[PDB]
Amino acid sequence: PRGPQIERLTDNRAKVVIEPLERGYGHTLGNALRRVLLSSIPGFAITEVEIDGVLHEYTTVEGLQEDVLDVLLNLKDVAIRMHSGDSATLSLSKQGPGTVTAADIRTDHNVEIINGDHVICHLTKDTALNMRLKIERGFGYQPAAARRRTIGRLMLDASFSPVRRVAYAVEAARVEQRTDLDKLVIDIETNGTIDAEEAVRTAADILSDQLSVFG
Amino acid sequence: LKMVKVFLAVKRRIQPGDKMAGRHGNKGVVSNVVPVEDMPYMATGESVDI
Predict the structure, then answer these.
(1) Contact (CB<8Å) B46/A187
(2) In a 3-state reduction of DSSP, which class is residue A208?
(3) For residue A166, which residues of chain B lie inside 8 Å, CB to CB?
């Protein structure tokens, strides 16, 4: 066997190359890797947000344009990467006209915001905005009702997925002292959270600890 | 003497046992909620939802 290489076509989507494998290993290995990568990979997402001047998620906030709850819906698309942490509180502040981007928030030293140019809302009047939000981590996907007294705190569904789609296809290799070898590549499109090689390493570690029930 | 009215707001989720139809005239009920890793997928990587 040989260690996998990686080609970087795009900074958000990479691909790994695994070679060589015997007959009957490549299809089941790619299927198991796709199943583990799309089943449960731990990442970070948003949690319940404590908003200052908004009572509940159906009011009319002054200065902010055209929505209240759709700001909370569009705030789920941000990417959170943390180093040695599982709970962090962030808060943003903006005043005056202009749009509100994801990079305009006040982050921590370890908390880094990926693709911060994503739009959140729009401010049309000279007003303040302070939304204190939390970041939790876990595995799989948990809704708002399964996780959970202050009336000023609103719940929000946590749907973390560091990868979006994983595809793979086998091909024919070229080794002289044999007849055919199964060479395969794996397309991994991540949402700016974790690298594709580290995702492959964590998926292989999860499958190795899952295959320890027999030995 | 006194009459009060309280307005509630409930977000209805999607669950097995819900009737859902199309525009071409194919009415039916939903069956199961399968995870995305156990769904058919094309050569590009797009997973079929329905």
Answers:
(1) no
(2) helix
(3) 45
Resolution in A: 4.0
* d(C-alpha A171, C-alpha A38), whole Å: 23
Q: CA-nearest residue of chain A to B12?
A: A145
Look at the block and give the residue holding tokens 């994503």: A118
Sequence-ordered list of residues with C-beta below 8 angstroms from that of B7, at least 6 positions apart, any chain:
none
Nearest residue on chain A to B41, judged by CA atoms? A167
Q: How many CB pairs under 8 A join A and B?
A: 23
Phi, psi of A74 (to 5 degrees): -75, -15
Distance of CA A21 to the CA centre of its chain: 31
Cβ–Cβ contact A38 with B under 8 A: yes
What method did the depositors use to determine the structure? cryo-EM
Looking at 3.20.20.70, 2.102.10.10, 3.40.120.10, 2.170.120.12, the CATH number of the domain A43-160 comes to 2.170.120.12
Q: What's the CATH code, domain A1-42+161-215?
A: 3.30.1360.10
Q: Within an 8 Å CB–CB cutoff, is residue A70 touching chain B?
A: no
Relative orientation angle of helices A196-210 and A26-39, to the nearest 10 degrees: 100
